[PDB]
Write a protein that binds this DNA or RNA. Structure first.
Length: 69
RNA sequence: GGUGCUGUUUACCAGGUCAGGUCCGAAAGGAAGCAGCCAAGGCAGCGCC
């Protein structure tokens, strides 16, 4: 279960904007995304790093709730 | 080395285009620009010089 998936699922259009600013590898291995990449993605989708982390925060809980069934 | 071809490879770090999103604006409209893609580079094979 990756971010390509999480995508298939005003605050929603902005949640796509962010993933839309990532690369295939970042969607395939979210963990590889540290500060530098966060920065690239925030500016790339007119957001703020906090916003991204937020989106990253969600996927994590969503993924975590995927390793429980 | 250069050059052509082919395969491969490359988040951002003065290429181009720029979905999506963002910014400025009452608006008309401007602006920057991620991913992609094209280009360019890297690693190689073959040919040519």
């Amino acid at each position: 279960f990756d971010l390509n998936d999480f995508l298939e699922q005003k605050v929603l259009v902005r949640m796509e904007a962010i993933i839309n600013s990532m690369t295939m590898k970042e969607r395939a291995k979210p963990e590889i995304i540290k500060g530098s990449r966060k920065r690239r993605i925030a500016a790339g989708s007119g957001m703020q790093v906090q916003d991204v982390n937020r989106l990253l925060k969600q996927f994590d809980d969503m993924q975590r709730m995927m390793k429980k069934m």
